Design a protein around this ligand. Structure first.
Ligand SMILES: Cc1ccc(C(=O)N(CCCN)[C@@H](c2nn3ccc(Cl)c3c(=O)n2Cc2ccccc2)C2CC2)cc1
Ligand SMILES: Nc1ncnc2c1ncn2[C@@H]1O[C@H](COP(=O)(O)OP(=O)(O)O)[C@@H](O)[C@H]1O
Ligand SMILES: [Mg+2]
Ligand SMILES: [Mg+2]
Length: 327
């Protein structure tokens, strides 16, 4: 199975209106195409084909149903799966993965239309497996990488500033062990909320200590499911550092790009080992994990170069061949 790649374009924001930008992106969900006007105010265009394309009016629940549900079914069959969010800062990586609370409304978080992939997925795991006849346990962890240092965001009994260490898994060699990373047992929906709420608070604190934390950090959220025979499924959701930090500094972003390139061009040495991120997610790039990428872009003319760079990177990635296998 090739890595599945989809593109999500967000609506114009106000900064873009204030810069007097115009729209240079057209999404065609039916043909699964996105075309970008490369000229200026018609003049030339590039068209890319992806596995799916979501336009500016795409709702959170549409992304979840079309992209994540099929993947969650594989996880429950006992596969490992990974979804990346990739793209320029401000294009919707975090909105897609986590979402938001609807403002002047109350919804419970379980029913809030702005909820993203993670809340929905966690809600549905308990929902599906309870109805199934059950016999399952769920644990979650959240690690962030900033300037090639690992932080555990979910450990309540720990300062956010304490970094973790990693070493290779003796008996895996294609995965690593992260010393001290808390894998927290989640007993139900309500506990999910309080656990991740503390995580959000620690993030806030980390941002006061580190420059441009939210745009330069990589976030890896993992949920592991044990089911009584299924048996063991794992889902990794990765919110990557803003893609403008490279293009055409951030060692993990850099190496991820080289790993993609090496895999597509079939070069002999794939440099997994040159960054924390690619060491952690090695099995997701050319391994036995089923992987999807969500590439987020801006519609606006002033982001032309970053949008093209994102679409080129995403387009190449879908040539990577994975070979999924159940745990
Ligand atoms: C419906 C809804 C959606 C999102 C939020 C929210 O803003 N949050 C904090 C900041 C978001 N960047 C939430 C949040 N935090 N968080 C830290 C790391 C990660 Cl990963 C997440 C994440 O996935 N969420 C979403 C979530 C997850 C489970 C249940 C409900 C919402 C926070 C209240 C929990 C609050 C309510
Ligand atoms: N599809 C979308 N529709 C409406 N608003 C969006 C969409 N994607 C992102 N936004 C908003 O744009 C801003 C930045 O999104 P964000 O997820 O933080 O970007 P990123 O994580 O890639 O830096 C926030 O206001 C966010 O809610
Ligand atoms: Mg973000
Ligand atoms: Mg980040």
């Amino acid at each position: 199975k090739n890595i599945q790649v989809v593109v999500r374009c967000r609506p114009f924001n106000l900064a873009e209106r204030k810069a007097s930008a115009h729209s240079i992106v057209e999404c065609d969900p039916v043909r699964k195409e996105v075309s970008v006007r490369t000229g200026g105010l018609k003049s030339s265009r590039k068209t890319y084909t992806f596995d799916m394309v979501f336009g500016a009016s795409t709702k959170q629940i549409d992304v979840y149903r079309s992209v994540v549900c099929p993947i969650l079914d594989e996880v429950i069959m006992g596969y490992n799966c990974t979804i990346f969010a990739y793209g320029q800062t401000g294009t919707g990586k975090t909105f897609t993965m986590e979402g938001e609370r609807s403002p002047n409304e109350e919804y419970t978080w379980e029913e809030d239309p702005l909820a993203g992939i993670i809340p929905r997925t966690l809600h549905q795991i308990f929902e599906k497996l309870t109805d199934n006849g059950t016999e399952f346990s769920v644990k979650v962890s959240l690690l962030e990488i900033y300037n090639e240092e690992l932080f555990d965001l979910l450990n309540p009994s720990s300062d956010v500033s304490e970094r973790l260490q990693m070493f290779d898994d003796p008996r895996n060699k294609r995965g690593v062990i992260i010393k001290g990373l808390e894998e927290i047992t989640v007993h139900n929906k309500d506990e999910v909320y309080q656990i991740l709420e503390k995580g959000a608070a620690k993030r806030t604190t980390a941002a006061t200590l580190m420059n441009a934390y939210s745009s330069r950090s990589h976030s890896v959220f993992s949920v592991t499911i044990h089911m009584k025979e299924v048996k063991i499924g794992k889902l990794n959701l990765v919110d990557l550092a803003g893609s403008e930090n490279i293009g055409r500094i951030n060692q993990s972003l850099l190496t991820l790009g080289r790993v993609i390139t090496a895999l597509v061009e079939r070069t002999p040495h794939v440099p997994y080992r040159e960054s924390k991120l690619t060491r952690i997610l090695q099995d997701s790039l050319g391994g036995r994990t089923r992987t999807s990428i969500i590439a987020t872009i801006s519609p606006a003319s002033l982001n032309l170069e970053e949008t093209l760079s994102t679409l080129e990177y995403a387009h190449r990635a879908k040539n990577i061949l994975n070979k999924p296998e159940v745990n």
